[model samples]
Target: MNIFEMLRIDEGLRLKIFKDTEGYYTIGIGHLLTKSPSLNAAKSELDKAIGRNTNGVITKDEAEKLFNQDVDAAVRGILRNAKLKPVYDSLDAVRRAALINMVFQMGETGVAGFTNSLRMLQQKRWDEAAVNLAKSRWYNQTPNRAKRVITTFRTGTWDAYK
Candidate 1:
C-alpha cells in the first residue's frame, strides 16, 4: 500500500476550493488554505510549490506535488518526535504506513499525545496499541478513519487501505 494512495482514498483529491468542516478554505488533498498572517498557513507553500495558483484552482500535477511534500514533512516530523522515534523505527513497513497516515492527519503533536499507544507499539503489543489508539480522542473525532488505521496497526496489513 503506497502511502500516497492510502491517503488519497482518505483525504480525497480536488481541483477546486472547498470549505473544510471548520470552514477554512482548502484545496487539493486536505491542504488548508486559510490561516495566519503569512508565515504559518499552507498558502505560502502552495504558492511556492505551484508557482502562483489562480482562482482557487490547481492542476492534478500540483495537487500531487503538494501532497508529496505534505507527506514528507509529516514523516520527518514523526521520525523526530522523542516518543515516536523508537517505536516508529521498530515497525515494519506496513505498520509504518499506518503510523504515517495518523501523523499526516493529526500532526506529530497529536501523535505524541498517543503515549500509551506508542508505548504498546514499542513493546510489540499490537492489540494493546490498537486498543489504546481506539480509545483516544482522535478516534472519537473520526472513528471511520481511525478504525481503519487502528486495524492496520493491529493486523500489520494493508487491508485497511481498501
Candidate 2:
C-alpha cells in the first residue's frame, strides 16, 4: 500500500486528513491520554506526531492538540541535529515506509540518528545496513518489527513477517 493508504483513512472523523500529511503522518499504538480512548483520536495523534517529527513536513492541527507540543520545532530539532538524510535518500518507497514506521515507534533521534547505519544505507551496503538495523535498541524492543523490516530491506518482500 502507498503511505496514505497505509494510514487507513475514514470519513465521519472530526479530524480531516491534512493534504500534506501523507508521509508526514504519525501514529503509535500506545498510551495517549488517561481519558477517552478513541482509536480515531489515536490515529489523528499519530498523523500529527509524524508531521511534527519529520521536520514539519506535516502540519495537521489534530495531532498538535493531542501531543501538546510544538511538533514543527521538534521536527526541526531532529532534522537539524540528526543524520536522517542518508536513510531518507536511500530507501525505496516500501523501505521508506518501513523506516518511517520504525522512526515512528522509536522517535527521530534514536531511529534517524545512527550515523553508521545511515552511511551504510547511503553507500548501498544492504547487508551491513541490515545488520545495523538488527543491532538497534529497537531490535530488542521490537524484535518482530526489526526482523520484518530488515527482511523487507534485504529480500524486497512485504510478506517477510507474514
Candidate 3:
C-alpha cells in the first residue's frame, strides 16, 4: 500500500480527546501525550498538550501548528479510502471540508460504509446527503457535531455550532 494507506492502517484515527487503554491522554491519530516541562503540577494533561507554561494554553501560532498537523493526518486518512476519494476530490472547498471533518470523526473506513450518503454526495444531491447523514448512528451518537456537518454539507457554509 501507499504511504497514506499505510498510515491510515497503522495510525488509525481518533477525533476527540481520549485516554488509551494505558490511561494516557491521547488524540488525533493515536498521538500520545507528552509532558510539557513548562507546565506545573496544577495543569491537566490536556492543558499541557497546548500550553507553554502553567497558564494552560498555547499561543495561537502553536495551536495552529497542532491543528495543521492533525488535519494533515486526517486528509491522508481520507485519501487512503479508494471508494471515497473521487467524491472527495470532486467537492468544492466547503464540501471537502465537511467530508474531511467527518473522516476525522469517523475514520475513512467508517465514513466509507455510509454508502448512501457517499452516493448522494457523488451525485451532488446535497439535501439527500444531509438527510442520509442525519439518519446515521454517528448523528445519533453526537447530535450537535453531526448537525454542524450536515448543515455544512447541505448549505456549503461554515457555521460556528459550538
Candidate 4:
C-alpha cells in the first residue's frame, strides 16, 4: 500500500477542527493548525478548496490532500536528516515506511533522538530496534499506534493495520 493510504488508517480523517492529544487545534487528518502559517491561511485554503468559508471545514478531498502534503513533508524530513537519511536509504520500502510512520507522528527531531534505535535498525536488529522505539513517552501517548509501528519495525512488515 502507499504510505499515505496506510497512514490514513492510523491518523484518521477529520473534516473540522478538533484538539489533538496535546490540545493543539488540528484538522484534516492530523494536520496541525497551530503549526501552520496561520489558522486564517488555513481558512482561506479551505475556502478556496470548497468554495465556501463556512468557518473553516474541509472536505475529504481537501483533507486527503493536506494529509498527503504532510506525509510528503514527513518524507522530506526523513531524507534531510544527515543521520537518518542514510539508514533510510539502506532500508526496504516496508522499513522505510515504518520509519516514515514513526517520524510522521513524532516529528524527525524526536525520532532522530532515538540514536540507539536508529543504530539497531541500521544493523537489522529487528526486535532491538522495535523495543528501543517502544521505550518512549510517545508510546505512552498512543500505545495502539506505537504497537503497530513497533510491530512494523520488528517484522519488517506492514500487516499491523486492519
lDDT of each: 0.81, 0.51, 0.66, 0.81
Q: Which candidate order results from sorting by TM-score in descending order?
A: 1, 4, 3, 2
Please, what is the TM-score per model? 0.87, 0.53, 0.62, 0.87
RMSD, one per candidate, in order: 2.8, 9.9, 9.6, 3.0
Candidate 4 per-residue C-alpha lDDT over 1-162 given as tens digits, one digit per residue, 9 for 90 to 100: 767877887888888877677666677888776645466765665566456665867778878887878889999999999888988998989889988988888898988898888999999999888888878898888999889888887887778975
Candidate 3 lDDT, 1-162, residue by residue in tens: 232333343345554555543354555554545434322332455456665442443444554455566668678988888888988898987778788777755668898899989999999999988998888888987687678678878987765332
Q: RMSD, model 1, all Cα superposed? A: 2.8
Spell out the clash pairs found in candidate 3.
none
**Over 4 Å off in model 1, which ranges?**
35-49
lDDT of 4: 0.81
On residues 26-132, what C-alpha lDDT tens digit does candidate 2 reach at each position? Answer: 32222122132454554555545554433323334444343334333334444564477555656676766555555544557776567787787777688888898
Worst 10 residues of 2 by lDDT: 5-14
State the displacement of the C-alpha of residue 124, model 4, in Å, after optimal TM-score superposition: 0.6
Q: State the weakest 10-residue window (summed lDDT) of model 3.
A: 1-10
lDDT score for candidate 1 against the true structure: 0.81
**What is residue 8's positional error in candidate 3, in angstroms?**
22
The TM-score measured for candidate 1 stands at 0.87
